């Protein structure tokens, strides 16, 4: 039992791993199905069909990169559909010829709600599919690991400039401490973007946002947002500049800041607004 890719790379008897490079639809939208048909690239055959019958399965299938974070999916195997990423071993396909035949595997991937812009970037790992080979002869249990990579960028249609999320909540370590804030932006057409913060501050510099908490609130402290090592006062335009189909981080970091008194224990909460400026 051996396998081979359409682009040369093969896996001999005993199992092993191989990198597959697939072409993907450069544009796929919500409701539409991105199809990664692997029955045209991964092939397998039986080396001793006169004495041994091979049994092959899609043992496990995992999603990576943009598929894991922007796509919901199912997998086609020998005519039947299963959840993707897989959660159970599929029924077996019989291999009984020396003639290399297609491994009946297809990926059906639909964009999620948060998808937009470059969902799957070029050269990135999109999937890992584990083939499992056995037989009625031996007790051979071989694994053929297939690392599915995208050859090209896959763009989810977007209109204008859209942000990562609308509600981003970040939790701080116990005082004192800091946290990165996962916030991105992508534009359909490359546009010059800026942004400013909004809210209620406690300091003259208008940078330390007040602890809005009204449960067990901690006094003395507040939250201060920083970027590139520099504190960002409220109502202060930070220009990101050229922003296109690739996500551009706002580079925000939540910190504790001192009001001008003495810190007491309790909850801390600040609601900070982000507003984008165009051109």
């Amino acid at each position: 039992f051996a396998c081979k890719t359409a682009n040369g790379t093969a896996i001999p008897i005993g199992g092993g791993s191989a990198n597959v490079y697939v072409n993907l639809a450069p544009v796929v939208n919500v409701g539409q199905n991105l199809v990664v048909d692997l029955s045209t690239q991964i092939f397998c055959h039986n080396d001793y069909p006169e004495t041994i019958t091979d049994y092959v399965t899609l043992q496990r299938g995992a999603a990576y990169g943009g598929v894991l974070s922007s796509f919901s999916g199912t997998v086609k195997y020998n005519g039947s559909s299963y959840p993707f990423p897989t959660t159970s071993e599929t029924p077996r396909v019989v291999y009984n010829s020396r003639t290399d035949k297609p491994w009946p595997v297809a990926l059906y991937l639909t964009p999620v709600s948060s998808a937009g812009g470059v969902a799957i970037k070029a050269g990135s790992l999109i999937a890992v599919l584990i083939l499992r080979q056995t037989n009625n002869y031996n007790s051979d249990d071989f694994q053929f690991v297939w690392n599915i990579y995208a050859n090209n960028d896959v763009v989810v249609p977007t209109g204008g400039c859209d942000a990562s999320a609308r509600d981003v909540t970040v939790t701080l370590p116990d005082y004192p401490g800091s946290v990165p804030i996962p916030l991105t932006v992508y534009c359909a057409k490359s546009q010059n973007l800026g942004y400013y913060l909004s809210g209620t501050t406690a300091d003259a510099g208008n940078s330390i946002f007040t602890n809005t908490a009204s449960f067990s609130p901690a006094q003395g402290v507040g939250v201060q947002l920083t970027r590139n090592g520099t504190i960002i006062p409220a109502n202060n335009t930070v220009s990101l500049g050229a922003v296109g189909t690739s996500a551009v981080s706002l580079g925000l970091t939540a910190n504790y800041a001192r009001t001008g008194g003495q810190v007491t224990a309790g909850n801390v909460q600040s609601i900070i607004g982000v507003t984008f400026v165009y051109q």
Partner: peptide
């Protein structure tokens, strides 16, 4: 705001 950031913290004793 286009995005609202909620920042949860806590001070222990």
């Amino acid at each position: 705001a286009d995005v609202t950031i909620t920042v949860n913290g806590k001070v222990v004793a």
